[PDB]
């Protein structure tokens, strides 16, 4: 029954005695920027002593403070070092220096789901169900450890060499029993309760699964507009439109996931996630073979070699400068 039992015992031990300071910058060769954002970037690096390639996330401590993301940042690394699941990107090392925080993760060369979805336009329902299944298993794992993920989007899902998903960016992930209130996430993916400040729980993640699945199958999100305020008005308004190519089952799933009514939103009711797992739209899914990676991927990325980055966009390179004075040392003490 509860595979989660074992799971949780291993997580809790890592959670209370988290790994710290397990490498240093000079052990890595910087190769290229794979992505960028708010408090820092993600770089392809090469581990000098093994020749392994990694993805190194760099956060400027001063910028993290300025954006009021200190706690979120400590959350991110504490949780990511403690979890373990086939569709969750692995944290190999972490450390910090005078200026930055570093999280050295598994390199996933297939690029972002985002890139292939926009390029291809939309996915086939079976294709989208393959990915979705992976997220349904990941969310039941995460929620079983009392974690909210809070940042689901194709931009955050990487495609591996086998065509399976790896979830990245735990910048908003949080271990919380009960409910929480932070306004965070991505406008297209927010649940009604977040926008309305009602206080919320892991149900927000199940809505987000509703947005993802829709976006994947249709090629655009269920709620979009040129500015975020308009997007909130749409989400809050209780109304969704579906492409005529959506199959009946899929509309029914989505109607239950993009459920403004917490008491009726799927994954949030008495039967939990089995309400999702048992749905007819997932009728042809072997949940077990999906976990064991025994299903055949719809799509397998092309990479002309190791450390090859054609599946990622090009970003302007910037130098990693390290100050001679320690910055915000007390704020990031436990990192």
């Amino acid at each position: 029954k509860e595979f989660l039992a074992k799971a949780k015992e291993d997580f809790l031990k890592k959670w209370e005695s988290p790994a710290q300071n397990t490498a240093h910058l000079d052990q890595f060769e910087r190769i290229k920027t794979l992505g960028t954002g708010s408090f820092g970037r993600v770089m392809l690096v090469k581990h000098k002593e093994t020749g392994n390639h990694y993805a190194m996330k760099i956060l400027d401590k001063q910028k993290v403070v300025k954006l009021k993301q200190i706690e979120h940042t400590l959350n991110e690394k504490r949780i990511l070092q403690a979890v373990n699941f086939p569709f969750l990107v692995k944290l190999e090392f972490s450390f910090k220096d005078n200026s930055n925080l570093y999280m050295v993760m598994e390199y996933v060369p297939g690029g972002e789901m985002f890139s292939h979805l926009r390029r291809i336009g939309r996915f086939s329902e079976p294709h989208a169900r393959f990915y979705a299944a992976q997220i349904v298993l990941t969310f039941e794992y995460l929620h079983s450890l009392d974690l909210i993920y809070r940042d689901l989007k194709p931009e955050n899902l990487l495609i591996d060499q086998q065509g399976y998903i790896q979830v990245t960016d735990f910048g908003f992930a949080k271990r919380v029993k009960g409910r929480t209130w932070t306004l965070c996430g991505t406008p297209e993916y927010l649940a009604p309760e977040i926008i309305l400040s009602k206080g919320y729980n892991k149900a927000v993640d199940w809505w987000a699964l509703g947005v993802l699945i829709y976006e994947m199958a249709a090629g655009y999100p269920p709620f979009f507009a040129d500015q975020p305020i308009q997007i909130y008005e749409k989400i809050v308004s209780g109304k969704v439109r579906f492409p005529s190519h959506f199959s009946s089952d899929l509309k029914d799933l989505l109607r239950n996931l993009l459920q403004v009514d917490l008491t009726k939103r799927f994954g949030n009711l008495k039967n939990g996630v089995n309400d999702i797992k048992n749905h007819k739209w997932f009728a042809t899914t072997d949940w077990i073979a999906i976990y064991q990676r025994k299903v055949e991927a719809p799509f397998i990325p092309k990479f002309k070699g190791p450390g090859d980055t054609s599946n990622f966009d090009d970003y302007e390179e910037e130098e990693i400068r390290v100050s001679i004075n320690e910055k915000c040392g007390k704020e990031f003490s436990e990192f």
């Binding site: 954002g37 708010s38 985002f114 926009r118 336009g121 940042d151 989007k153 931009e155 910048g171 908003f172 306004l183 965070c184 996430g185 991505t186 406008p187 297209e188 249709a218 090629g219 655009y220 979009f224 507009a225 040129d226 975020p228 439109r241 492409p243």
Partner: peptide
Amino acid sequence: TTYADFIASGRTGRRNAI
């Protein structure tokens, strides 16, 4: 079409979290 509206919208690139 909704797809055409999307594509012409200012949100088809990577979306920043809030």
